[PDB]
Amino acid sequence: ALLRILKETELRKVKVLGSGAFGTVYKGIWIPDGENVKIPVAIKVLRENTSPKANKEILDEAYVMAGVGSPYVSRLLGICLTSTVQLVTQLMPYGCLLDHVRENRGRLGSQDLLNWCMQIAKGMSYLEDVRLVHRDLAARNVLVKSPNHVKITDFGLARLLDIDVPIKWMALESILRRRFTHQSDVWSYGVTVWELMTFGAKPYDGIPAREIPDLLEKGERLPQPPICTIDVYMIMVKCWMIDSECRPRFRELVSEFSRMARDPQRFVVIQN
Ligand SMILES: *[C@@H](CC(=O)N1CCN(c2ncc3ncnc(Nc4cc(Cl)c(Oc5ccn6ncnc6c5)c(Cl)c4)c3n2)CC1)CN1CC(F)C1
């Protein structure tokens, strides 16, 4: 129910990690009052130019995930309120999963890749339990706590303006009508799995975004990754069905990748 407010004196910014349309993320340290501890944190400072109604949707989305949560989705530790709005969370020291897979292409195993697929599916199952549509699931928006533990973050939203999109991850209905559901998140999950299994290849590389809807209706899809057996590719293909009702549920995806994770060398073919 309650919300933990952290004073400015409890927090210290060290380095800039990244940014987007809504805010700037810093690496930092949290020292809670009346405790002899240091906690490494990420601190997201929201931009001052944006209106009150625009920043409202970011905060309200965090407050839905109030109770126990999931270990595979980012957890808000608290907020700090100066002239700026500062959102505080546990630091994920290996950064985003897209950068991680590209760097470690030489030494990653079949067990590691399929474990990540299962963990992302478990995290998305929790977001469906609390009725939270992500709108922007991609390898860039999954963080790495360690090589055997990943967390979903960077929850998507349209910027509300007074006046004064990731097309290659989106379901067909989302491109043409701007309809976002739990079943459109499943499409984006399929593309995320394709990124991991290609060691961070760019989807539809060379094809302009305007051409994507016509190609999808014709039946063209992203190619089978070189390391994947057909059994793995079949799950990706089910995620990209035009009929949203025929796509698998996130709980069924947890079941499938858990089974494949119990015999990873059968399903994914690494050189080593
Ligand atoms: C990927 C590169 C990339 O984009 N990033 C990796 C480096 N950065 C980074 N590193 C570690 C880290 N740990 C923890 N948290 C963050 N980022 C973050 C994100 C959000 Cl959305 C955030 O706010 C909320 C809001 C609501 N909420 N509810 C529950 N939890 C939360 C969190 C916070 Cl406080 C912190 C983080 N970031 C930046 C990300 C490749 N990329 C492709 C090229 F463009 C490079």
From Swiss-Prot:
Keyword vocabulary terms for this entry: Activator, ATP-binding, Cell membrane, Cell projection, Chromosomal rearrangement, Cytoplasm, Disease variant, Disulfide bond, Endosome, Glycoprotein, Kinase, Membrane, Nucleotide-binding, Nucleus, Phosphoprotein, Receptor, Signal, Transcription, Transcription regulation, Transferase, Transmembrane, Transmembrane helix, Tyrosine-protein kinase
Record text on subunit structure and interactions: Homodimer. Heterodimer with EGFR, ERBB3 and ERBB4. Part of a complex with EGFR and either PIK3C2A or PIK3C2B. Interacts with PLXNB1. Interacts with MUC1; the interaction is enhanced by heregulin (HRG). Interacts with KPNB1, RANBP2, EEA1, CRM1 and CLTC. Interacts with PTK6. Interacts with RPA194 and ACTB. Interacts with PRKCABP, SRC and MYOC.
Q: What name does this protein carry?
A: Receptor tyrosine-protein kinase erbB-2
Q: Spell out the post-translational modification annotation for this entry.
A: Autophosphorylated. Autophosphorylation occurs in trans, i.e. one subunit of the dimeric receptor phosphorylates tyrosine residues on the other subunit. Ligand-binding increases phosphorylation on tyrosine residues. Dephosphorylated by PTPN12.
Which coarse location class describes where this protein primarily resides?
A: membrane
Q: Where is the Protein kinase domain?
A: 11-268
Instruction: Point out the coiled-coil segments of this chain.
Output: none
Catalytic residue list? 136
Expressed, tissue-wise, as follows:
Expressed in a variety of tumor tissues including primary breast tumors and tumors from small bowel, esophagus, kidney and mouth.
List locations, semicolon-separated.
Answer: Cell membrane; Cell projection, Ruffle membrane
The residues listed in the UniProt record as binding ATP, with positions renumbered to this chain, are 17-25, 44
What is its biological role? Protein tyrosine kinase that is part of several cell surface receptor complexes, but that apparently needs a coreceptor for ligand binding. Essential component of a neuregulin-receptor complex, although neuregulins do not interact with it alone. GP30 is a potential ligand for this receptor. Regulates outgrowth and stabilization of peripheral microtubules (MTs). Upon ERBB2 activation, the MEMO1-RHOA-DIAPH1 signaling pathway elicits the phosphorylation and thus the inhibition of GSK3B at cell membrane. In the nucleus is involved in transcriptional regulation. Associates with the 5'-TCAAATTC-3' sequence in the PTGS2/COX-2 promoter and activates its transcription. Implicated in transcriptional activation of CDKN1A; the function involves STAT3 and SRC. Involved in the transcription of rRNA genes by RNA Pol I and enhances protein synthesis and cell growth.
Source organism superkingdom:
Eukaryota
Gene Ontology MF annotations = ATP binding; coreceptor activity; ErbB-3 class receptor binding; identical protein binding; protein heterodimerization activity; protein tyrosine kinase activity; receptor tyrosine kinase binding; RNA polymerase I core binding
Q: What is the effect of changing residue 46 to P?
A: In LNCR; uncertain significance; somatic mutation
Q: What is the effect of changing residue 67 to S?
A: In GASC; uncertain significance; somatic mutation
Which Gene Ontology terms of cellular component type are present?
Answer: apical plasma membrane; basal plasma membrane; basolateral plasma membrane; cytosol; early endosome; endosome membrane; ERBB3:ERBB2 complex; membrane
GO BP field:
cell population proliferation; cell surface receptor protein tyrosine kinase signaling pathway; cell surface receptor signaling pathway; cellular response to epidermal growth factor stimulus; cellular response to growth factor stimulus; enzyme-linked receptor protein signaling pathway; epidermal growth factor receptor signaling pathway; ERBB2-EGFR signaling pathway
Q: Which family does it belong to?
A: Belongs to the protein kinase superfamily. Tyr protein kinase family. EGF receptor subfamily.
The UniProt record lists the keyword Oxidoreductase: no
Gene name, per UniProt, is ERBB2
- Is Glycosyltransferase one of the keywords? no
So what does mutating residue 148 to S actually do? In OC; uncertain significance; somatic mutation
- Indicate the disease this protein is implicated in: Glioma: Gliomas are benign or malignant central nervous system neoplasms derived from glial cells. They comprise astrocytomas and glioblastoma multiforme that are derived from astrocytes, oligodendrogliomas derived from oligodendrocytes and ependymomas derived from ependymocytes.
